[PDB]
Amino acid sequence: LGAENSVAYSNNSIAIPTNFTISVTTEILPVSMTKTSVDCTMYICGDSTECSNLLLQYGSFCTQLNRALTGIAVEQDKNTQEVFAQVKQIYKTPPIKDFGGFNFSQILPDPSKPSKRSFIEDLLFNKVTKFNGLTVLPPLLTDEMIAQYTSALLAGTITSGWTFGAGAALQIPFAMQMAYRFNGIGVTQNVLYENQKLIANQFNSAIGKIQDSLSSTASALGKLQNVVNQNAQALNTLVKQLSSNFGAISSVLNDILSRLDKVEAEVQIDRLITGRLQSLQTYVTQQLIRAAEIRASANLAATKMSECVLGQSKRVDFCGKGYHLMSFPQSAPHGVVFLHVTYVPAQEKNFTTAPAICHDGKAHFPREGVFVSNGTHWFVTQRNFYEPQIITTDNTFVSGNCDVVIGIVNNTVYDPLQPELDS
Amino acid sequence: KCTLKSFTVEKGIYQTSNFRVQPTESIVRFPNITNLCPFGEVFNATRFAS
Numbered sequence A: 001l002g003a004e005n006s007v008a009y010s011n012n013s014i015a016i017p018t019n020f021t022i023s024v025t026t027e028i029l030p031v032s033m034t035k036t037s038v039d040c041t042m043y044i045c046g047d048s049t050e051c052s053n054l055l056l057q058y059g060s061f062c063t064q065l066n067r068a069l070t071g072i073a074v075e076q077d078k079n080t081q082e083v084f085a086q087v088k089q090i091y092k093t094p095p096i097k098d099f100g101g102f103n104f105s106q107i108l109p110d111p112s113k114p115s116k117r118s119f120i121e122d123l124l125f126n127k128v129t130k131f132n133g134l135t136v137l138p139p140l141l142t143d144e145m146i147a148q149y150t151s152a153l154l155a156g157t158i159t160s161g162w163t164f165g166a167g168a169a170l171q172i173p174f175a176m177q178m179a180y181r182f183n184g185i186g187v188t189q190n191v192l193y194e195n196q197k198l199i200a201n202q203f204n205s206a207i208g209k210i211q212d213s214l215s216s217t218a219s220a221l222g223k224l225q226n227v228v229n230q231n232a233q234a235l236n237t238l239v240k241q242l243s244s245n246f247g248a249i250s251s252v253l254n255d256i257l258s259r260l261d262k263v264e265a266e267v268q269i270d271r272l273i274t275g276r277l278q279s280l281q282t283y284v285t286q287q288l289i290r291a292a293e294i295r296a297s298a299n300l301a302a303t304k305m306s307e308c309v310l311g312q313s314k315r316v317d318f319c320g321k322g323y324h325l326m327s328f329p330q331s332a333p334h335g336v337v338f339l340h341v342t343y344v345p346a347q348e349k350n351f352t353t354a355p356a357i358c359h360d361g362k363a364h365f366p367r368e369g370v371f372v373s374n375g376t377h378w379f380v381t382q383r384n385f386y387e388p389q390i391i392t393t394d395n396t397f398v399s400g401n402c403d404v405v406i407g408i409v410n411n412t413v414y415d416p417l418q419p420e421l422d423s
Numbered sequence B: 001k002c003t004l005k006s007f008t009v010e011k012g013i014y015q016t017s018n019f020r021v022q023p024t025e026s027i028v029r030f031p032n033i034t035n036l037c038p039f040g041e042v043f044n045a046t047r048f049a050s
């Protein structure tokens, strides 16, 4: 299974991360499959009138099989709108890219591309790769229209945080937009500004590594490729079935029509109709059940979009390893790609710790964070990033005498009012 | 209307196939021959093969 780990638990000990690292992780979802339709009259009978008059004896079989495929063919567009049409106005970013050193130039639209794709969208459209009364119908949105919405969502996110999701887009300097998203993961905003140059480089490097990841191997894109393959596979099989005799004397209907008396033909052809019709009913059942699976994935993508792009996640591991900071969409064949951006705690240190401190009889508790000691001094610290500060009457609150709390310890809680009154 | 079995139809797009969806198919004539076939040479043979 994996490497074993006895976690070094003891009631007096805690580990706090002294440092952190930004990560970016790719996630890929199917959203809509190849729209198809069949003229069953043409497929079954090859436009023999003789055969068509036998097909009337089965009544409303052909019409309902064409109805079901037309129903699937509509909802493939609706799935695509549910994912991408979540932004009501086409935002675009001002020309100067002074996002505090963060460098989106890989994922923004590239002005060189005539279809207005980003650099990484233009990888995805390359890593992913019929004619007998069957048809394919093209999608309602062109791949350029999808690339417009995956610009608008990206420009809105860079310029205005959650606000364009909640209401109208409100500008905020991008450094501050990260500062509030940092408070969102319970790491205090001063940690961001005090480290900003390091943060922008840890982010920009990870975008750099995604170019390599999606250039160097196709292996991840298999999850979209399968939707193309399966529909090509089904259509190829549905055609090769026309070679099946079905216990008639030939697969070529013109043989029976040329060689036989009506009395014999109206037996032979009725085997072919029975066979071909059951062959089509098999395909239509497969498409209904396959469409139900793709629609479940489209609704998951629509949720990922509304929660992890338009907002910030408080749902652990809904949007990648680490605590969630932000996410970006990129458009892809039959699907969508997310670039989640996340915070990961990166360098433990051990500390001795206590649930409370007793002063002069008063039991003090931290207002936020944990009481820790390096061995001689007692500090409050914020939980997810080490920042030792002296325990004091303004970073604490009091409840009762010492005795109630298990394992309480003694240190003076310093009182910042006093030297002013000493003036 | 016939394709939907309804005298009234809503705003939309509807598939159909009826008008002859392929152009002018039509079939006639054969390759040629030189004689009447020799059946009488067998059918009125004097005595048949073993």
Ligand SMILES: *[C@@H]1O[C@H](CO)[C@@H](O[C@@H]2O[C@H](CO)[C@@H](O)[C@H](O)[C@H]2NC(C)=O)[C@H](O)[C@H]1NC(C)=O
Residues within 6 Å of the ligand: A018, A019, A020, A021, A198, A201, A202, A346, A347
């Ligand atoms: C926190 O971890 C990061 C790497 O995740 C460290 O970043 C390096 O910092 C040194 C200077 O201190 C630079 O020479 C390296 O180039 C930095 N690496 C990157 C990827 O930018 C950082 O030093 C760590 N900080 C602490 C306080 O431990």
Ligand SMILES: *[C@@H]1O[C@H](CO)[C@@H](O[C@@H]2O[C@H](CO)[C@@H](O)[C@H](O)[C@H]2NC(C)=O)[C@H](O)[C@H]1NC(C)=O
Residues within 6 Å of the ligand: A103, A105, A106
């Ligand atoms: C933002 O990142 C891009 C690459 O992702 C940088 O663009 C390259 O810059 C070098 C010079 O530093 C040029 O030789 C390349 O031809 C550029 N490539 C592309 C695709 O434009 C860009 O310099 C970075 N900008 C900032 C402000 O960090």
Ligand SMILES: *[C@@H]1O[C@H](CO)[C@@H](O[C@@H]2O[C@H](CO)[C@@H](O)[C@H](O)[C@H]2NC(C)=O)[C@H](O)[C@H]1NC(C)=O
Residues within 6 Å of the ligand: A374, A375, A376, A377
């Ligand atoms: C716990 O942390 C405190 C503060 O960093 C350490 O005490 C300081 O030690 C330096 C020398 O390294 C002295 O110059 C300061 O005067 C000390 N400050 C105080 C308030 O005493 C302390 O040594 C650390 N203890 C352990 C066990 O790591």
Ligand SMILES: *[C@@H]1O[C@H](CO)[C@@H](O[C@@H]2O[C@H](CO)[C@@H](O)[C@H](O)[C@H]2NC(C)=O)[C@H](O)[C@H]1NC(C)=O
Residues within 6 Å of the ligand: A358, A408, A409, A410
């Ligand atoms: C915290 O300090 C107080 C004194 O300020 C310590 O209280 C004494 O504890 C012993 C054992 O319970 C008693 O015999 C004494 O009578 C206590 N004195 C008073 C004035 O109450 C206490 O033990 C210290 N606790 C810790 C965790 O260090």
Ligand SMILES: *[C@@H]1O[C@H](CO)[C@@H](O)[C@H](O)[C@H]1NC(C)=O
Residues within 6 Å of the ligand: A008, A013, A348, A349, A350
């Ligand atoms: C933390 O302290 C415990 C004390 O038993 C020790 O076993 C453990 O190895 C330490 N962990 C680290 C990461 O220093």
Ligand SMILES: *[C@@H]1O[C@H](CO)[C@@H](O)[C@H](O)[C@H]1NC(C)=O
Residues within 6 Å of the ligand: A010, A011, A012, A406, A407
């Ligand atoms: C802390 O746990 C140790 C065993 O790890 C135990 O001996 C000790 O009594 C405990 N103390 C408190 C205050 O729970």
Ligand SMILES: *[C@@H]1O[C@H](CO)[C@@H](O)[C@H](O)[C@H]1NC(C)=O
Residues within 6 Å of the ligand: B039, B040, B041, B043, B044
């Ligand atoms: C064969 O001979 C009979 C008379 O014996 C004659 O009526 C018939 O037309 C002949 N048929 C052929 C094919 O020669």
